[PDB]
Paper text:
The three-dimensional structure of MmpH was determined at 1.35 Å resolution from monoclinic (space group P21) crystals. Although there are two MmpH molecules in the asymmetric unit of the crystals, the enzyme behaves as a monomer in solution, as suggested both by size exclusion chromatography and DLS analysis, and underscored by assessment of the protein contacts in the crystal using PISA26. MmpH is globular and mostly α-helical, with a diameter of approximately 45 Å. Thirteen α-helices (αA-αM) are arranged into two concentric layers to form an (α/α)6-barrel. At the center of the (α/α)6-barrel there is a deep cavity, opening to the exterior at one of the ends of the barrel. The catalytic base (Glu628 in G1d and Glu393 in CpGH125) seems to be conserved in MmpH (Glu262), as is the network of solvent molecules coordinated to these residues and that participate in the inverting reaction mechanism. In agreement, replacing Glu262 of MmpH with an alanine residue completely abolished its activity. The drastic reduction of activity observed for both Asp47Ala and Asp50Ala MmpH variants is compatible with one of these residues being the catalytic acid. Interestingly, in MmpH the volume corresponding to those residues is part of its large depression and could accommodate an additional sugar moiety, in line with its endo-mannosidase activity and in contrast with the exo-mannosidase properties of GH125 family members.
Numbering used by the authors: 6 to 351
């Protein structure tokens, strides 16, 4: 508009803005961006929503959301897994959820150039990434969760792939701030090595599409290895004309997973298939610009029966990447992100 993403024939800039406005309309007075009005909030989707608001130019609600991150961050640097209208429902810490604030903050700095925002959020990001690295296991993978009684010492490939990208975003912010973080550089290098070379470190979750594309989306796997991985499961997940399955054994396509795959395809230059998959998930779009979570494609039922802010948010981020509209559009492509210390693995 002309600053708002659009994809001709698929998504107008007006439609992109409308989806972002539906996210903003769900914001709680605290700044939380929940799944939907009356639903719960989780930190990862909260940040995802704030990134989409930034892309669409709704900077006021986006800043209120980042303020919520700052004001609710707990003493150890974490956020609870689940809150509902300010009532904590799951007080454990999910390492993936806590790290993602780094991505959202760096994305916001890329788009706005707002150094005062960077200075305000830098201690938030630093405390969060320090907390996440304190969950790293000896092999380099990250424990998926922490509770008051200790770490859950299983690692999830999707979460680790997301954290890998989040820490690289934290390192980009560290450079912007002029405050080197050698410990983060070591940690992210060891994490990337585990993702790439130690499959035995992660719980086996082969049926989930996110486990298939997240190593590519997060940048742990690129080039020939990434192209091979995408092609390896393509037909298990991609449903012609409809997007992609959340799990390989249910006739159920989901908008967010489709749009995350779009970002992964864009990252490896597969713009032909990125555009095809992006175009194929807009049957989930509702009249107010919000998106249904998913479709049971062999009977026509939406499932779950919910329109989720973060499905529209994922769509917006994919639209920005395809159109290369805002200065944050390439944050997953990651051309300029630091790599950390690639070596000395233990
Ligand atoms: Mg809280
Ligand atoms: Ni190794």
């Amino acid at each position: 508009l002309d600053a708002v993403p659009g994809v001709p024939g698929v998504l107008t800039p007006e439609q992109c803005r409308q989806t972002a406005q539906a996210i903003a309309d769900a914001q709680e007075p605290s700044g939380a961006l929940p799944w939907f009005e009356g639903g719960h909030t989780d930190p990862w989707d909260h940040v995802e929503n704030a990134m989409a608001l930034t892309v669409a130019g709704l900077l006021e609600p986006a800043r209120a959301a980042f303020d919520w991150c700052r004001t609710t961050q707990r003493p150890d640097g974490s956020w609870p897994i689940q809150i509902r209208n300010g009532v904590v429902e799951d007080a454990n810490s999910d390492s993936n959820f806590c790290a993602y604030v780094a991505t959202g903050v760096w994305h916001h700095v890329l788009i706005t150039g707002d150094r005062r925002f960077a200075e305000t959020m830098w201690p938030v990001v630093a405390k969060a990434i320090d907390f996440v690295i304190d969950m790293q296991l000896p092999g380099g993978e990250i424990a998926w969760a922490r509770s008051p009684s200790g770490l859950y010492e299983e690692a999830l490939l999707t979460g680790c792939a997301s954290i890998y990208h989040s820490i690289r975003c934290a390192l980009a912010l560290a450079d912007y701030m002029g405050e080197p973080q050698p410990e983060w550089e070591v940690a992210v290098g060891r994490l990337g090595h585990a993702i790439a070379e130690h499959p035995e470190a992660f719980v086996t979750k082969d049926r989930w599409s996110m486990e298939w594309y997240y190593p590519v989306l997060g940048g742990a796997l690129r080039g020939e290895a990434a192209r091979a991985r995408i092609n390896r499961r393509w037909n298990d997940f991609v449903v012609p004309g409809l997007g992609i399955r959340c799990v390989d054994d249910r006739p159920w396509v989901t908008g967010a997973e489709t749009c995350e795959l779009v970002l992964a395809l864009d990252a490896i230059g597969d713009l032909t298939r990125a555009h095809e998959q992006f175009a194929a998930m807009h049957h989930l779009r509702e009249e107010d610009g919000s998106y249904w979570t998913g479709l049971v494609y062999d009977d026509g039922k939406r499932w779950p029966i919910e329109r989720t802010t973060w499905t529209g948010a994922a769509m917006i981020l994919a639209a920005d990447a395809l159109s290369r509209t805002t200065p944050g559009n390439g944050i997953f492509r990651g051309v300029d992100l630091p790599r950390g210390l690639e070596g000395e693995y233990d």
